[PDB]
Point group: C6
Chain length 213, copies 6
């Protein structure tokens, strides 16, 4: 990464390889990726993806998402013809952003320019977009199927509800509706009766402390 260029640390590499081995494509793996790739060059970003053995269906899907985003970049940013002047960088293509047709020094060149061409952060967006698709697709449950069991503690139901919700393929407005409609609706008879008496203004804390006893 760039803090001056610096090689990606052995501990960073190992941490990323381990989380993929241990947790596959659970939602929390994405902010971990983002955190381990802070200030990453495209080279560093490719290093992290390429160090993954297994899961090659997902890694292939990720490539295709990356290529779509790169093609969309090219459409919006047509490269102008001409010789590059002294002390200037060429305009980066989608493939340059993704690290395949640009060198490390060119990536250092773009990232440290005034004003910067933040190719690391652009490529990182595309990767996370692709990781989101994989997380959503590899989710085993739908939010409509999360229903509290007759002897299930409310805390356990809410844990499963919001785990599934975090994986759901929907915006925040839709997520608000899922919380507003389904959470109380799919609680068990006794807790569902208690929560309806609180009303639709109740906080999660209130709902949880209400169905505690």
């Amino acid at each position: 990464p760039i803090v001056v260029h610096q090689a990606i640390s052995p501990r960073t590499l190992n941490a990323w390889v381990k989380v993929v081995e241990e947790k596959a494509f659970s939602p929390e793996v994405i902010p971990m990726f983002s955190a381990l790739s802070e200030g990453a060059t495209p080279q560093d970003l490719n290093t992290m993806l390429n160090t993954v053995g297994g899961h090659q269906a997902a890694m292939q899907m990720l490539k295709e998402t990356i290529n779509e985003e790169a093609a969309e970049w090219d459409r919006l940013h047509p490269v102008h013809a001409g010789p590059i002047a002294p002390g200037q960088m060429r305009e980066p293509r989608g493939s340059d952003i993704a690290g395949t047709t640009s060198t490390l020094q060119e990536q250092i060149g773009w990232m440290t320019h005034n004003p910067p061409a933040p190719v690391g952060e652009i490529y990182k967006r595309w990767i996370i977009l692709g990781l989101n698709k994989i997380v959503r697709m590899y989710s085993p449950t739908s939010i409509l199927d999360i229903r509290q069991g007759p002897k299930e503690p409310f805390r356990d139901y809410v844990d499963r509800f919001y785990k599934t919700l975090r994986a759901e393929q929907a915006s925040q407005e839709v997520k608000n509706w899922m919380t507003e409609t389904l959470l109380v609706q799919n609680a068990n008879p006794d807790c569902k009766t208690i929560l309806k008496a609180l009303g639709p203004g109740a906080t999660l804390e209130e709902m949880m402390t209400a169905c505690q006893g």
Copy 2:
């Protein structure tokens, strides 16, 4: 964090993920969070919360607490209309403090200004307030129910008393009353008689050495 901006270390991330896995929401997890997040940007703070898989009922409660605090900030700090002058930062909203509508550079901008706008430390307050609510709520025992067993060493009773007390949802004045009233009252017959003979001026050390034999 900021010491110059620095990426959050793999060891810091792993340490935080591990403590949540191992200890859930035991009281000691909060000073650990605070220690691992020293000089954290809002981005760093969101990274730590977002890297948690599981416990999504608590993580959702935390979001709601964060949103309440953000709304209260907005009420007390109405944003003034106008173009931002050269070499000045805009006034941060609650959502900017919580890292959702502000960039990393804006957070660096506020935190390193003269005088500083300490958005990292403000957001950290809100998070710890929310973690406190969770710790208190997830506590399995009340301080009124802590009673020394007939063959229980006094040290073991006092260990359970102050563990439960640390989790209790009360101020220091109330905690002083709990110590002043309940500790001796709920000791076993033989130790309770011994402690009443010491009187209400006795230190914990004195009380413990008295009920040793």
Copy 3:
């Protein structure tokens, strides 16, 4: 490595030795090598290869590849006769690039010159070329033999397909043809019928979500 010369870190050495022990010559070992050897001198590169015990057939093959590349370098770069002027470096031979006939200071000398003679990155190319040969040769499967089982989830078939494809000894144009022709052709009867109905324009995501149920 050079960031100023720096000794190769114990953690870097151990990380490289471990990955060879654990994963042998799986495709992902190569980007790991590359990542652990960022800014490496030829001395550092020889250190990493020489620290491997076992697999000496592969390590010998690697030497021969290195020697071929070194001989090809010498052919293209005939050394000119004459005394080296003050504040100048001699032209490096293939053996100098590979670290056997050059000193550490000479490698520092070439790598930090204006303009640089990037002997570390040249030798690293030759090593990775040789590692590729080994990976390809040590692959146990051919892409033609990857066929979906009658009760095999499509995701598992695609995982095996692209794992084998990554090891295949072919260019990207050939790889595109392998994806275009074989993937659908060697799916099981029920999924193969479904994928033909999508057509040859379908993304991997689409193909995978189609054969999910």
Copy 4:
């Protein structure tokens, strides 16, 4: 700590938490605490104590010792009334030294002043005084009860003697008397006879090599 302020390292935190878990309040835990808290601010010192789960009887005793020392500081250092001048620090109270009524910047302010107000080292004294009380109180043995067994190697007896002595609640003059009187007196008949023949001028080395055979 301060080396410039620096956040307490994850490895330091973990090392302290582990030693308390593993060794409880064995005498060697105190120099470990001191070593792990070198140049610590009061904030850092509270972080270390607060990260301890369990042992809350001891942690409460420690608080009370801290409060006694803070009250004694206040008595000896009455705060003078007046506005604090430009480029000056206020006089710290006991609660400021203990980190509860002072900010981190105020602690940095006192510790880096010319001349310094070493609030970190003052609070560290109070903590170690309190840890000593706990170690002494939690010791299971008295030095008077350490007696060499009839078939016990002298080295093993001396190991138990000085382990118990290190925990004893006594000054060095008293410790010298314990060594001068009890060590030889409570040896077994055969070794006790041998040691009396050496006389009271003998070194520990001499005493140990004498009772070897």
Copy 5:
């Protein structure tokens, strides 16, 4: 080591102690030693050898090799008599190079002089010469005894061949002859017939892919 003098890192020490415990005097232990001792002073080099418990026959042999080399140095470098001038270092003896009659500051003095007296790299040569003797002597097999089994995969035979070859006590010209003569000669009947048909121009890759089926 010197990068300014720096103490040898705990991780470096532990890494060296572990490799000796785990791998004894396998050939790969030598480049590991060299890598862990980059820029080492003679003091650092003695630290590494002295931290080895066990294997004292080998460590004694190493001392004798070191003493031979030191005596040879003294013969070639007779020390000239006279007072050492201001801002000059004395000429180092063999014992000074080996760290026994020189101080740390004297070693820093020689290593950082203009031009340098590279006593660290000289002593490191002598140690590696001695380690080579030990590796060769402690090798359990001769290259003449490596013969392919009738059902042994060619890769396994070649692995054993070059493992034994790496330990052999011979120059590269002799090693070339061992490869040219023995490798094919001591293959099993079926593979030996196949390899003779390739001819003496064949690469190892070619020989291995030929005897694959």
Copy 6:
């Protein structure tokens, strides 16, 4: 340590505690101590000794050795009476060198003076002298009792010989005599006959390769 003063690292502390737990007072523990305490202040040196739990007979012996050396220092260095001038350090006593009557800043003061008063290296000498006494005393074998078994490989005998020799309480001239006289004398009949035929000029390598078959 001092590299500027620096706190002793958690990894250094743990490494020292572990080696004492694992290896007790084996000869190799002493160079490990020395290596882990490079540039240590007396405070750092006391930290390392004080962090040891158990072995308090040895730790007490060490104190007594330290006190002897401190008393001898005082005898040779009588402190001169007078007020200390501006920008000067007082003459250190034995107790100041051992860290008990001097502060950390005073130790920094002496160690960084021009010319330096190397109190860290002086105290380190005294400690290692005391550790040597303990190693020698705690050795279970005498060099006179090391005799090759009738079916014992010569390498194993030589390993035991030099392990015991390293622990022996004797100078290098005496050690040379032990090697010259006992090693061959206490070999088994068949190897003893072979070694006498080599003569007293033979190297260890020669002796070992001679008794190999």
